Design a protein around this ligand. Structure first.
Ligand SMILES: Cc1nn(C)c(O)c1C(=O)c1ccc2c(c1C)n(C(C)C)c(=O)n2C
Ligand SMILES: Cc1nn(C)c(O)c1C(=O)c1ccc2c(c1C)n(C(C)C)c(=O)n2C
Ligand SMILES: [Co+2]
Ligand SMILES: [Co+2]
Lengths: 379, 379
């Protein structure tokens, strides 16, 4: 059941912004590890005396990495005279965020028809304002409201080329890496209490709820279910400590837990990423035992051939099924020093009309199947 | 003239420590860009609840990357019960350093015969103490005094395997990269006033002075001239703004300007580094004009063949000569967001007895020769 209750017109995920201590080193690491190209910059060389911002792209996926300069470089500026390309940026907020949480996502940005209307409707419906709507070069409008913890939901709308004040990256520094990642599928938050978090976000967006292990969760979705925002809470008192609780402890509270990146060829993406794990890229969680891939024949034997199942086993890929589609997924180890944010690589098969959002679910069935596999491999 | 006036026995450079916001991403970027292997760690997985520290090695070169965890993880600890592997570490100092200077060198570490005696003699001779001598597992002693700005000179001595509490890195995560870098040749500081900086450092070490462009500089050296610590000050009032002054502005004061890394085969190192510049590694300063390499025939035609001169031209390598040896060198663009710290790759030819320290100088003649080359190429 999809009541299509969005309180304003939402299009697609637009970008994810990481707040960093040094944007250069994080962006270069991510570029090589994920196969994303350097496509735009806003920094000292573009006249920005406030923050260094670097944009990586793969397909429609946009990752922005931002760090503050010394405040002394811009001490004479005021907001009317700022050289910052992102007017919501604040030195103190960024330093406070990074000292509190470490490397992590500050903004989940969605493209909307009208960022000023989106902001006004959200705040009229309970959203806590973070940055009021600001029109950039009479071309783009940006506004921000609080999502959870110190993460903001950023609205971007275009009258008619990332943002004004960003420059295209020169082709010499713009090596055309591509491991097959094409877009953001979903962005997941961890909170101490799921109920109040869901009520708050669904309250100001009109997003609807989309259709033992240490977590309870729920998924909020836009009208066409292309913007997907799951939220998790921990389950206490279990034998094994909840990984959601571990997140909250090491992150100093609520924040973004994982980004799921859709691949157009998850086999190629994982081959390319795994080749680079020990040479500057990303590590992956330990692979399931062979009993898992043996049991996959009975579960997904009508969707994947035996060869493709064998290809899943080489790469450590997980498979899950809903009533409408099938999910291939795998998880990285945490992206930085703290056991907090990580990345999921996903590919979905089924639900063709284009492919509808959330085809195959989010893999919650893999908890029990991994468990059964571990017990079976112990035998 | 070498008066051999060291006030305590100094051996060699031991390691360089960077203070980071996220040590994982910086260390992974540096590993791929410079061809250094992950060799040791001290972090949550080794019981360290205080800081994450990762050691990269290439030959005798040791780069350490350290970042703080949330103070909440260690809030119940006191110094007698600390889980930190580097007892001088302090959360507040590290956050203050990074917010002030950005990514940069906190410690220049030299191995000495007795770190406690080195500390006591230094402080008795004017050194400002930073961290008193601490014996680690009855095996290693570490102590720190201020060098310039917020950079410390760290003394390490071994009774008889980086530091106690560091664990060797498992071979799966330890990919054997190697682009030919073998050791630290020199470490250079930028200060506002050279005189007082030299007097201070030479005062407490007994290091001696080793044998138009925007800088004045001088080099301090240990007895065998294997530890080399140049210091620069800006020259004001020139047409072009001093790059030393630019450093001081963007760094918020004095600090380490560049690390010069000796290669056993600078041609291989530069081929390997340049292949990776646009895929996560390091960029290099713009190459000199072809008139430079034409003029090199008359300057170094007796040391390098025409083919090897042509190889220098492909890779953008600079060449300088002293009275005793020849210097091949090249400089990276800044390592992070700010126009502050960069790296020099160096190889020295001549002065064989082993090779004596500082063979060929430090390349100051390349200022005039680059200038002449630029005017000649304008023609
Ligand atoms: C669950 C869940 N709910 N929603 C809305 C999602 O997007 C998810 C997941 O992406 C997911 C699915 C299966 C997992 C898993 C995750 C994070 N992890 C990590 C290590 C915790 C596992 O070990 N397994 C087996
Ligand atoms: C000088 C100097 N003194 N000492 C003690 C050193 O180690 C040096 C250098 O390493 C050096 C030599 C030549 C240079 C240079 C540097 C840093 N730069 C940078 C961009 C400023 C140039 O453009 N040229 C031509
Ligand atoms: Co997921
Ligand atoms: Co040098």
């Amino acid at each position: 059941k999809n009541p299509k209750s969005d309180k304003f017109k939402v299009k697609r995920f637009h970008h994810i912004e990481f707040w960093c201590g040094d944007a250069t080193n994080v962006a270069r690491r991510f570029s090589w590890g994920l196969g994303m190209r350097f496509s735009a910059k806003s920094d000292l060389s573009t006249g920005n005396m406030v923050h260094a911002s670097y944009l990586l792209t793969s397909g429609d996926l946009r990752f922005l990495f931002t760090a503050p300069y010394s405040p002394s470089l811009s001490a004479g500026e005021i907001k009317p005279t700022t050289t910052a390309s992102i007017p919501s940026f604040d030195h103190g907020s960024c330093r406070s965020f990074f000292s509190s949480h470490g490397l992590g996502v500050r903004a989940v940005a969605i493209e909307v028809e009208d960022a000023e209307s989106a902001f006004s409707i959200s705040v009229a419906n309970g959203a806590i304002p973070s940055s009021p709507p600001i029109v950039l070069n009479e071309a783009v409008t940006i506004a921000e409201v609080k999502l959870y913890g110190d993460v903001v939901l950023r609205y971007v709308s275009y009258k008619a080329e990332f943002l004004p004040g960003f420059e295209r990256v020169e082709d010499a520094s713009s090596f055309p890496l591509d491991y097959g990642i094409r877009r953001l599928d979903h962005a997941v938050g961890n909170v101490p209490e799921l109920g109040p978090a869901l009520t708050y976000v669904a309250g100001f967006t009109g997003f609807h709820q989309f259709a033992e292990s240490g977590l309870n969760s729920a998924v909020l979705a836009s009208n066409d279910e292309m913007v997907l925002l799951p939220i998790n809470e921990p389950v206490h008192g279990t034998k094994r400590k909840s990984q959601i609780q571990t997140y909250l402890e090491h992150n100093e509270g609520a924040g973004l837990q994982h980004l799921a990146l859709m691949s157009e060829d998850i086999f190629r993406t994982l081959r390319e990423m795994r080749k680079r794990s020990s040479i500057g890229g990303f590590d992956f969680m330990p692979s399931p035992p062979p009993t898992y891939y043996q049991n996959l024949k009975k579960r997904v034997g009508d969707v994947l051939s035996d060869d493709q199942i064998k290809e899943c086993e080489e790469l450590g890929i997980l498979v899950d099924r809903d009533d409408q589609g099938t999910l291939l997924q795998i998880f990285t180890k945490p992206l930085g020093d703290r056991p907090t944010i990580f990345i999921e690589i996903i590919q979905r098969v089924g639900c063709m009309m284009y492919q509808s959002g959330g085809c195959g679910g989010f893999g919650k069935g893999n908890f029990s199947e991994l468990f059964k596999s571990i017990e079976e491999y112990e035998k």
